[PDB]
Amino acid sequence: THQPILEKLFKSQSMTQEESHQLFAAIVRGELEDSQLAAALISMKMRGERPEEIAGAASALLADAQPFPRPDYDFADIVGTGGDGTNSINISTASAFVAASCGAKVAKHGNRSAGSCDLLQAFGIRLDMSAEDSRQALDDLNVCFLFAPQYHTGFRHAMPVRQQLKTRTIFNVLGPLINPARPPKALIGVYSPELVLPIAQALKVLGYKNAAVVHGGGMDEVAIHTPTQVAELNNGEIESYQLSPQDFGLQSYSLNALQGGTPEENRDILARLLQGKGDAAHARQVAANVALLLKLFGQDNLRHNAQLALETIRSGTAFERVTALAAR
Amino acid sequence: THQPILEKLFKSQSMTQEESHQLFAAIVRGELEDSQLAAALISMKMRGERPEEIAGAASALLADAQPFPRPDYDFADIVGTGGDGTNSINISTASAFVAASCGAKVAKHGNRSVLAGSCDLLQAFGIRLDMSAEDSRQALDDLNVCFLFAPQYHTGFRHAMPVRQQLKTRTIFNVLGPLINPARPPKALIGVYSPELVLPIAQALKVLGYKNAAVVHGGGMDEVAIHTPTQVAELNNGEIESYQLSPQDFGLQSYSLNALQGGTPEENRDILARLLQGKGDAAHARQVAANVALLLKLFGQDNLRHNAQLALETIRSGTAFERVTALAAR
Numbered sequence A: 001t002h003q004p005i006l007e008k009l010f011k012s013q014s015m016t017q018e019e020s021h022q023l024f025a026a027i028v029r030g031e032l033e034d035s036q037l038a039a040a041l042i043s044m045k046m047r048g049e050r051p052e053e054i055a056g057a058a059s060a061l062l063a064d065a066q067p068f069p070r071p072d073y074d075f076a077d078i079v080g081t082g083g084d085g086t087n088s089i090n091i092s093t094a095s096a097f098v099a100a101s102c103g104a105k106v107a108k109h110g111n112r113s114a115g116s117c118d119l120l121q122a123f124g125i126r127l128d129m130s131a132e133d134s135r136q137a138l139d140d141l142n143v144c145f146l147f148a149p150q151y152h153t154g155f156r157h158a159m160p161v162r163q164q165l166k167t168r169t170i171f172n173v174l175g176p177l178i179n180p181a182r183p184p185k186a187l188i189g190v191y192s193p194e195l196v197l198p199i200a201q202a203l204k205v206l207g208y209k210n211a212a213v214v215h216g217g218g219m220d221e222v223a224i225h226t227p228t229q230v231a232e233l234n235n236g237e238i239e240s241y242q243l244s245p246q247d248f249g250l251q252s253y254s255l256n257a258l259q260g261g262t263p264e265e266n267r268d269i270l271a272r273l274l275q276g277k278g279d280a281a282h283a284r285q286v287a288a289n290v291a292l293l294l295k296l297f298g299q300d301n302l303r304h305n306a307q308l309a310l311e312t313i314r315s316g317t318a319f320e321r322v323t324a325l326a327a328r
Numbered sequence B: 001t002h003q004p005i006l007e008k009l010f011k012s013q014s015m016t017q018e019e020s021h022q023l024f025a026a027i028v029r030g031e032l033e034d035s036q037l038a039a040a041l042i043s044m045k046m047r048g049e050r051p052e053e054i055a056g057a058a059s060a061l062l063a064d065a066q067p068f069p070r071p072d073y074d075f076a077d078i079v080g081t082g083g084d085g086t087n088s089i090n091i092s093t094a095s096a097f098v099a100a101s102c103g104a105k106v107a108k109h110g111n112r113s114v115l116a117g118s119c120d121l122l123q124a125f126g127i128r129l130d131m132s133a134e135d136s137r138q139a140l141d142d143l144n145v146c147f148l149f150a151p152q153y154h155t156g157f158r159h160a161m162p163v164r165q166q167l168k169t170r171t172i173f174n175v176l177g178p179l180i181n182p183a184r185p186p187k188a189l190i191g192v193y194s195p196e197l198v199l200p201i202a203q204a205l206k207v208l209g210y211k212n213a214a215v216v217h218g219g220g221m222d223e224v225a226i227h228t229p230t231q232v233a234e235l236n237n238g239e240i241e242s243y244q245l246s247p248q249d250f251g252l253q254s255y256s257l258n259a260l261q262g263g264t265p266e267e268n269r270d271i272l273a274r275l276l277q278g279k280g281d282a283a284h285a286r287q288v289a290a291n292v293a294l295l296l297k298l299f300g301q302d303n304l305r306h307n308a309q310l311a312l313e314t315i316r317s318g319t320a321f322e323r324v325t326a327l328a329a330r
Ligand SMILES: O=P(O)(O)OC[C@H]1O[C@H](OP(=O)(O)OP(=O)(O)O)[C@H](O)[C@@H]1O
Pocket: A078, A079, A080, A081, A082, A083, A084, A085, A089, A090, A091, A092, A093, A094, A109, A110, A111, A112, A113, A115, A116, A117
C-alpha cells in the first residue's frame, strides 16, 4: 500500500521515477480503489506530468505486460496518442504496411477505439494472434500487429475510471510508450504541441535509440495540410525543428481531404489506397509519415524517402501484405 | 451532467457559489461515481477551497437536510471540524450545557466520526440521538439546549464516507460539518483544525448570512485555548475582524494541553460528569470557561473576564449536569 506516495501527489509534488513505477505497478495490479486511482491521475494532471514520471509509469506497465520474443534486427513502432480532435483516416496503420513494403520492419502496437484496429478486423486480421506468430509475421512480412489487450491484461483495472472521468490523463500518453516488443525505434504522434518535447525526453529516459515525436495542424502525426513540429532523439541527443510538406517534395493539401467515414467506407479507403487507387491527399500524408520514419533507419533524404513510399503505395504491393497477414 | 464543472476544476479554476451548490447538490444524492467525487475533492484540495465555494457546498447540504422548526429568539451553535489530533476532552459539548445553564440558548449540531466523539458522550449520558425535531425544539425552549445529530438530519452526508475514508486525507468535507446546522442558527462559535482556515470559514459564514459568529484555532486545538494564544475571526454587524486572544485576556490561569487530554469513552464520560457537576479538574473548568466566555460575546457580552467568571460559577454550581439529566429525561 502506497499512501505515502499519494500525499506527495496531493501536495503538488512530483514523484521520482521509482516512486511513479511503484504507484503504477500497484495500479495495473488492481491494488487501488476507484477513488485513489482517480486522485492520483487528477493530482498528476493538474500539476503537469514530468518525463521521469512518464518513464517510470511506462516502465511499470511493460513489466506487467505479456512476453514477446524480441528480435535483433532493427524494427520500430508507428503509433500515436490519438484523440487529435480532427476526424481523420488511420494514417499510422496505413504507414506501417507501406513502410514494411518500403524496407522497414514495423511492429505496431495499439487497441480498438469505429476508430482504429477495427478496420484491421475488417481485413480479416485476427487481433489475438499469438506472440509466436506475430514474431514470425514480422520476420517474413516485415510487419505484425500487437493488440494491447492481450499484452496488457492489467490495463482493464484503469479503463472504468478513465471512462467515468471523461478527461485526458497520463494514460493517454502512456499508450504509445508500451509496445511489448520493446522496439528501439519509433514514430510517435501526440495530440498536443506541448507534448512533443516532454515525450521525447521520456523516450530518452526509456533508452530509445532513434525516435521522433510529431504534431501538426492538430494532427498527432506528420501533416500535409500544415507544418509539423518535431522532436527527434538520436544518440541520446534531442533536436527540435519543423517540417513542411514541401520538405518531402510533396504539395501542401487540406485537412478536410483527410476526413474519416464509417466502418465500411474507411475499410474501402485503406484498401483502395494500399492498392494504389485512393486519393492524392491520402497517399501524400502517408508517404510523409513513412518518409520521416525511414529517417529513423538512417535514410536522411526525406524527398527520396517520400518518392519511394509513394511509388510503393501506388504499386498496390502493400495491400498484398494485409492479406498475407490475414491468413494467420 | 456536471461535466463542465469538473473540467473547470481540473484546470485549477474556482467554481462560483452557484456552480459549487450545483456540484454538491449532486454529490449528496449519490449521483457521482467514486472516481468523479474523488476527482472533485482532490482538485479543490490542491488549489485551495474559496469562501464562495464553501458556502455553495454548505447551502446544498442544508437544502436536503431534514426540516427543523427554527425559533425566532436568539440561539447559537458551538462546534468544530474536530480532527485536531489533540485528544482533549469534549470542550464544545461541555460548553454547550454550561452556556445554557446561565441563559444562552444553544442548539448544538454534532457530527459522527470513529465511539470517541461528542455524540458518543451524550449517548453515554442517556440522551436520545434520534429525538424528533419537535422534541429538540421543545428542549431548546425550556432547557436552553438540544442536540441535533448529523446522521438524523443529513441523510446524503453518507454518499461520501466511503471515498472520504479511502482517500485518508483532508478535504472540503472536514470543514462543512460545522456549517450545516439544521436549525440555521444566527450565532455560532466554530472551531477549526488549522490557523489558516479561520478567516476563510468566517468569510463563508458571512456569505451564508450569519449575524454574529467567531471562528477560532488555538495552539493546535479547534477550540479557544488557555495553554496558548487563540487565533480568532469575528463576524459582527456584517464585518469580520481578525485578532488573537490570550489566557490573560480571560483572567484565566494558563494550563497545559496535556492537562486537557482525554481517554477511552468511559473516562471521557466520567470526566465530563465530574466537570459539569462542579467536581472536575481546574484545567478542564478553565478551558470550558474560556470557550463559554467567547460564546457569550456573540450575545452582546463584551467583557471576557466577566463572562469567564460567570462560566466558572456556573460550573461549580453543578446545574450544567442537571440540564444533562433533564435533556436525557426527554
Ligand atoms: O480518439 P480517436 O480520435 O478515435 O483516436 C484514438 C486512437 O488513435 C490512435 O491510433 P494510431 O496511433 O494507431 O493511428 P491509426 O489512426 O493509423 O490507427 C490510437 O491508437 C487510438 O486507438
